[PDB]
Design a protein around this ligand. Structure first.
Ligand SMILES: CC(=O)N[C@H]1[C@H]([C@H](O)[C@H](O)CO)O[C@@](O[C@@H]2[C@@H](O)[C@H](O)O[C@H](CO)[C@@H]2O)(C(=O)O)C[C@@H]1O
Ligand SMILES: CC(=O)N[C@H]1[C@H]([C@H](O)[C@H](O)CO)O[C@@](O[C@@H]2[C@@H](O)[C@H](O)O[C@H](CO)[C@@H]2O)(C(=O)O)C[C@@H]1O
Lengths: 185, 184
């Protein structure tokens, strides 16, 4: 099963929606691998909108976070960061989703294969293999989980507006076939 | 054989070294796929140092370029950009090289397989697959090739300092085994 799930969460641009106190959030804050699946509708023209983030929101730690994000040009991406000297692993895919319309995206991080895969609307859109595999448990001082933005020194960065229709986070690594199916209509 | 090669080029921080007029530069400016192999020594503490770039250096086109870069913290990466709405395909690998010392890195971009692979000092360090494969020929208005920085609105960005010991650009997609051997 999922370790954290939410449904029907509408977010006013800029505000975010804090998940840090939810049952399961502690698990999400320590993930060594796993899968994130999100259905959403954006109503914002912000250039970078985090759907889900997990990171360190404290002063001086603004480059220590993970987020799965969309853009105002129909892009989908993620960033996994613990300051640039430690790691900055990113995917950014163009023309993968559309903006008002429901989309479903997913990211998996697979420790055994050292691989990250991004899916949108029933398609695998990118794969990253890194010799030095990292995930959330490698970020230093993770203290929050949020929908619709990323906490950076107490400010909601990369603000989303619209609806998080469904969000599920898994410790399990779903198969590509599963993610093609679950991100479809 | 390479389509563009240079050896023994010193570059001070900020200066760059223009290759735009060299025979073969036109080919580099239009690559649909290929391989870049560079041996270098950095003397600079700049956080992002382009070893080789190919892009559009004109005003308002600062997000239209390709570069293969190293960092002050022993990292290696690349960015391939034509404005973020079009594409922004990147790799960034930590603790892959050392400043201390000569290092050799390589990037291949394989159109058939829609794949980019980065190598450093005899190891494959990252692989990127993109559904929408892009390379230099997809960048709009490419007008320069340089060593040791990236031209952005007439300024040398991401400035390298040190020596480009050997730089080769190929239209061919070299094998992983070839790259493991040449970089190690
Ligand atoms: C998702 C993404 O591309 N994020 C970038 C981020 C954004 O480009 C920016 O916040 C708004 O578009 O920029 C990051 O880098 C910044 C640097 O480019 C800038 O020189 O200095 C900034 C600090 O004032 C900041 O470090 C960022 O916000 O961390 C890098 C990130 O990948
Ligand atoms: C290799 C890399 O991370 N390149 C980044 C670049 C560098 O982080 C930065 O130039 C070094 O200081 O930052 C880029 O994004 C910038 C935005 O973060 C910033 O909000 O606005 C800047 C323009 O005034 C700039 O766009 C960049 O320089 O393009 C993104 C790039 O991937």
């Amino acid at each position: 099963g999922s370790v954290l799930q939410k449904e029907g969460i509408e977010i006013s641009e800029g505000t975010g929606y804090d998940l840090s106190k939810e049952p399961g959030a502690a698990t999400v804050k320590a993930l060594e691998q796993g899968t994130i699946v999100i259905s959403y509708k954006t109503t914002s023209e912000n250039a970078i909108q985090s759907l889900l983030s997990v990171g360190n929101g404290t002063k001086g730690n603004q480059d220590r976070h993970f987020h799965l994000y969309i853009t105002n040009a129909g892009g989908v991406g993620m960033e996994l960061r613990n300051t640039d000297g430690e790691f900055k692993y990113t995917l950014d895919c163009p023309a993968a989703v559309r903006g008002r319309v429901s989309n479903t995206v997913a990211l998996k991080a697979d420790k055994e294969n050292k691989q990250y895969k991004l899916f949108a609307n029933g398609e695998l859109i990118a794969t990253l293999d890194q010799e030095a595999f990292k995930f959330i448990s490698d970020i230093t001082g993770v203290d929050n989980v949020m929908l619709g933005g990323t906490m950076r020194q107490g400010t909601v960065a990369y603000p989303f507006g619209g609806s998080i229709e469904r969000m599920q986070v898994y410790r399990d690594v779903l198969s590509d076939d599963e993610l093609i199916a679950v991100t479809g209509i």
